C-alpha cells in the first residue's frame, strides 16, 4: 500500500511525456539481482533501505526542487520517510557475512550513474523525465510491487 502511494505521487510529479524524450532514453543498469527472489525479502531489508534513502537524496537536491512541484515533492518525502521508519523499526526489533554491503554499493553506483546523467544532460526537462520514469521502474522492482 505504501509502495503504491509512493508511485502514485511520483506519477503525479510528471510534467512532460516520455514520448517527447525518446532520444534521451538511457540504460542506467539497475542491479536487479541484488534484490534476489521474493522469498528472501528479510535479507533485502538493508538494500531496500539504501534504495529508498538514495531516492530521497536524489529528489531532495536543489536541482530537484527546481524541476518538480513543491507540494507533490513534500508528499513524496513524507511517503519515503514512512517507508524508512518501517524498515528501521524492524531492524531495531542480522547474520549475513557481507551484511549485503556489496549490494548496497551496487545500489549506490546505480544512483551515481543517474546523478552523472543529470549533470551531463544539464538537468534538462527530458533528462528529469527519463530519471523519473527510471525510478518508477526500479522502485516497483525493488519493492516487488
Amino acid at each position, epitope marked *: 500500500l505504501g509502495s503504491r502511494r509512493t*508511485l502514485m505521487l511520483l506519477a503525479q510529479m510528471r510534467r*512532460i511525456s516520455l514520448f517527447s524524450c525518446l532520444k534521451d*532514453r538511457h540504460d542506467f543498469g539497475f542491479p536487479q539481482e541484488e534484490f534476489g527472489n521474493q522469498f528472501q525479502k528479510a535479507e533485502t531489508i538493508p538494500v531496500l533501505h539504501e534504495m529508498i534513502q538514495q531516492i530521497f537524496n536524489l529528489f531532495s537536491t536543489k536541482d530537484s526542487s527546481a524541476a518538480w512541484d513543491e507540494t507533490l515533492l513534500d508528499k513524496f518525502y513524507t511517503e519515503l520517510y514512512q517507508q524508512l521508519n518501517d524498515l528501521e523499526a524492524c531492524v531495531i526489533q542480522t547474520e549475513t557475512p557481507l551484511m549485503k554491503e556489496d549490494s548496497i554499493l551496487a545500489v549506490r553506483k546505480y544512483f551515481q550513474r543517474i546523478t552523472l546523467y543529470l549533470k551531463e544532460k544539464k538537468y534538462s526537462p527530458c533528462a528529469w523525465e527519463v530519471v523519473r520514469a527510471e525510478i518508477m521502474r526500479s522502485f*516497483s522492482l525493488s519493492t516487488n510491487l
Partner: single-chain antibody
Framework: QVQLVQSGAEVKKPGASVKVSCKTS????????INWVRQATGQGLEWMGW????????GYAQKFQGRVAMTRSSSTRTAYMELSSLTSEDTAVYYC?????????????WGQGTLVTVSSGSGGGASDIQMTQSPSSLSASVGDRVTITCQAS??????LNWYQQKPGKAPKLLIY???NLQTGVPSRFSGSGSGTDFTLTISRLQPEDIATYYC?????????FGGGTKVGITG
C-alpha cells in the same frame, strides 16, 4: 479498477467526420497518455497518434496528420479522437489505450473499440520502422511450441511489446520490454531477442491461445505493429 469505456458504433458517409470518446476511470486521468490505435476489417493494428492528458501535447502518425485531432476534457475524465474527411478505407475498430508505468507508451490498458463504418488498407511511410513478423499464419496441434519471429529495420534495443489479440477483443499485452512477462500472463509465453531480431515463443500450446499475435515497437516514432500471426489448432 482502471477502465477505458469508448463510445458506441458509428455509421458515417464519405467526407463526414467522426468523434470517438474514451471515458477513463480508476487512477488520475492527467498522469497517463492516451494512445489511439485502429484496426480495419482483416487488417493489422495501426497506430494513429497519442495525447498527453496532463498538458494536451499531441503527436500523430504522418498518415493521419491534418485529418485527426486528439482532445481531452479533464472535467469529464474523457479523451477524444476526431477523424475528418472519412473515406471508405477508414472503416475500422478504433481503440484507445492508457499508458504504462512510465506514463507513456502502449500498454495492457485498452478500450473496447469503436466500429466506424463508412457506407457509400494498413501501412505507414518509407522511413517508418518495419516490423516484419513471420509467419503470417501457423497451425500447430495442442502442445506444440509455437515460435514467432519479428524483425526490425532499425536497432530498437528492447523497446518491443508482444500482444495477443483474440477475435472481437482488444489486444492483451503478453511481454513488455522484449523479454519481461506481463503479470497474469502465463509463464509459458516467452519474450526473447534484442536489437533487430525478436522471437516470441508460446510453449505448451493450449486452446485458449488461439488468437492473432502482434509485435509493437517503441524505439522511435511512429509506433509500428508487426504483420500478425494467426495461430490456429489442427483437428
Amino acid at each position: 479498477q482502471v477502465q477505458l469505456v469508448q463510445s458506441g458504433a458509428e455509421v458515417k458517409k464519405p467526407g463526414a467526420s467522426v468523434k470517438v470518446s474514451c471515458k477513463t476511470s480508476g487512477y488520475t486521468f492527467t498522469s497517463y497518455d492516451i494512445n489511439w490505435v485502429r484496426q480495419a476489417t482483416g487488417q493489422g493494428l495501426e497506430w494513429m497518434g497519442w495525447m498527453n492528458p496532463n498538458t494536451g501535447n499531441t503527436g500523430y502518425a504522418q498518415k493521419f496528420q491534418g485529418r485527426v485531432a486528439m482532445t481531452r476534457s479533464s472535467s469529464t475524465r474523457t479523451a477524444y479522437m476526431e477523424l475528418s474527411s472519412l473515406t471508405s478505407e477508414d472503416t475500422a475498430v478504433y481503440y484507445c489505450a492508457r499508458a504504462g508505468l512510465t506514463g507513456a507508451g502502449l500498454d495492457d490498458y485498452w478500450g473496447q473499440g469503436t466500429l466506424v463504418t463508412v457506407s457509400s488498407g494498413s501501412g505507414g511511410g518509407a522511413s517508418d520502422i518495419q516490423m516484419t513478423q513471420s509467419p503470417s499464419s501457423l497451425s500447430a496441434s495442442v502442445g506444440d511450441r509455437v515460435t514467432i519471429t519479428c524483425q526490425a529495420s532499425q536497432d530498437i534495443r528492447k523497446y518491443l511489446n508482444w500482444y495477443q489479440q483474440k477475435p472481437g477483443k482488444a489486444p492483451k499485452l503478453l511481454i513488455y520490454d522484449a523479454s519481461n512477462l506481463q503479470t497474469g500472463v502465463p509463464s509459458r509465453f516467452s519474450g526473447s531477442g534484442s536489437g533487430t531480431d525478436f522471437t516470441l515463443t508460446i510453449s505448451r500450446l493450449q486452446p485458449e491461445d488461439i488468437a492473432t499475435y502482434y509485435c509493437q515497437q517503441y524505439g522511435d516514432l511512429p509506433l509500428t505493429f508487426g504483420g500478425g500471426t494467426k495461430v490456429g489448432i489442427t483437428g
